[PDB]
């Protein structure tokens, strides 16, 4: 979504969680933080919905 954006992903701001131990716990933390970042993106999308055809 960052390096090769598609649709309007280059118009929303979010962070990318990064691990350091390469284990299950770090991936759990990354998934939880990705849920939080998805909430952030959802807020930005809700405030930026344009009119027009579908």
């Amino acid at each position: 979504r960052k390096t090769q954006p598609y649709d309007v992903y280059d118009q929303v701001e979010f962070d990318v969680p990064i691990g350091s131990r390469g284990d299950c716990y770090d991936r759990y933390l990354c998934r939880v933080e990705e849920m939080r970042q998805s909430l952030r993106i959802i807020s930005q999308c809700l405030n930026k919905m344009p009119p027009g055809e579908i």
């Binding site: 939080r36 909430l39 807020s43 809700l46 405030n47 009119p51």
Partner: protein, 71 residues
Amino acid sequence: ASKVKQDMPPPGGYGPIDYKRNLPRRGLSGYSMFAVGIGTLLFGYWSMMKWNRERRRLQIEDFEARIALMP
């Protein structure tokens, strides 16, 4: 003839949406917990000391009752 109507955000925007981690501290110090534990232990020790001394006296009393009844 009427205005175009569509599902749109309200004028202005939407209220801010919280997303960040919220884990409050909500705890006592270590010294306080340890002190409470030690005080509870000391209180229990003193109470049980008195109770067991009284129990020893009672045991001696009934042992003496036995000794009197033995002949």
